[PDB]
Amino acid sequence: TLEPSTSITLAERQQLAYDLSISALLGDKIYNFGELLHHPIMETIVNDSNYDWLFQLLNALTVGDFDKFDSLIKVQISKIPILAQHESFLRQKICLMTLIETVFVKNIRMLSFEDISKATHLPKDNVEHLVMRAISLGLLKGSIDQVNELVTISWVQPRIISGDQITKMKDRLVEWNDQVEKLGKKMEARGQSIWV
Amino acid sequence: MSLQHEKVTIAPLVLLSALDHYERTQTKENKRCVGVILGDANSSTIRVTNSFALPFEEDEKNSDVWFLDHNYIENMNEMCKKINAKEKLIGWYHSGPKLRASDLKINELFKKYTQNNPLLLIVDVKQQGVGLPTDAYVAIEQVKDDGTSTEKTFLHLPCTIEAEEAEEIGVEHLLRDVRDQAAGGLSIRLTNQLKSLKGLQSKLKDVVEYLDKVINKELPINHTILGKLQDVFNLLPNLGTPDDDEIDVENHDRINISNNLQKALTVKTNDELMVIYISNLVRSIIAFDD
Amino acid sequence: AIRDEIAKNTELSYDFLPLSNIKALLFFNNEKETEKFALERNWPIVNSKVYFNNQSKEKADYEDEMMHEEDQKTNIIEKAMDYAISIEN
HEC string of B170-191? Predict the structure, then answer.
């Protein structure tokens, strides 16, 4: 809702850019990482050294790359102790972000704990902690069987959209269009005359 | 202004009256009848009881250029009280096949007289739609969180009807159709069952091609639409659930009731089989006697 | 003929036989003869143990493949349609 009037300077635009990334990295319910990447403020502000590594941190979260995230953080968590004093949320954030994306793209809404161990790059005890944390924020709902070692997801919280994601959602409708069409053609064919 | 809405209920009169007024301004070909909309509001359900024409001119060269006769609207409202003092402006109808972007600028003018955000009720005169031949919008101004400015935009609400009982029987009296889109016997609801499935096909088609249009022809990536689409999948079943196995057990149950009901009917008609034989049996004697 | 007969039977009876148990049942006196039949009858004897449940799948699958196939499976939807039309005949 910001004014067309100019009375925001470049300093403020960058100060806000930095703060918005700080909130998301140290948050626990912000998966609007792409929203910052789809607003001019932070997408076009990378033009200082501080906003070289920061933009890469927001990019690391979207793709689920742990190695890049850790290398950038390793340098910066020391320099800036705002990352230091809030570290727990920060490292667990990318595990939660990868957790919600995996379930999304599949058409079966369950993951093995063993699949999560690989994908979030946690040991098997700490995979069970991740599930517990996620449900406590309210990201996900469903049920846990520890005796089959599954979590079976029933509801996913909406998230940012991207071109890739559209094709993934589109294909599923193509099947259901097809199923609805041929189911109705066969039912049409039976009791042709009983449409009175 | 009420910024709380949920549904629009429509009286049957409203639709029919806008079609009458449409032909008597003789409007067609981007000249579209626009009249005022009268009814109850400050209610989440917008209840539209009546509508009347206004003197209105639509230029077809530019639809951003229009004529509205403001003075007339006050006089007409005083006569609305004469009929019933509980009818006020709650919007304005459009008679066209669909939403115009000049309709946002028109909506501005009726804000002045409404205690509720003004309604756009598209009364079609070709009577399209697989439900009612009315679409309904109300103009809302909101921030959009997609990185785009504050819009005033027409957001869709459901359409429903509230009909007076007195009026409704007039609809039945007028109508000589025995109804094939409303409930009846088995065969009638058998059509209603197929009709619903064919309605889902048409609606399911439009989403697929909207999604194609976004990533090749570059229509806005609208998150609010696509969010409801994510919930379609999460609320969609998965094979191998014990809930969908219980459906199999529940199928057995109602089909068996049909199986016994079918036997019961067969018994009863076999009583009439024997009756008629007893009627033929007597009537042999009567014939023989004559 | 008898060799073929018992080889159908053992699909139902077993899922696991050692080589010695296979040899007696098919009435062979030579070990190579048992393994010779097993290739041609299409028994997957791997590590001297048969897995007849693979073999049941094939024979079941063959019974479906032949086109009759709509009403062989028998559609949930189709039953209800049938019931309906008879009443509305």
Answer: HHHHHCCCCCCCCCCCHHHHHH
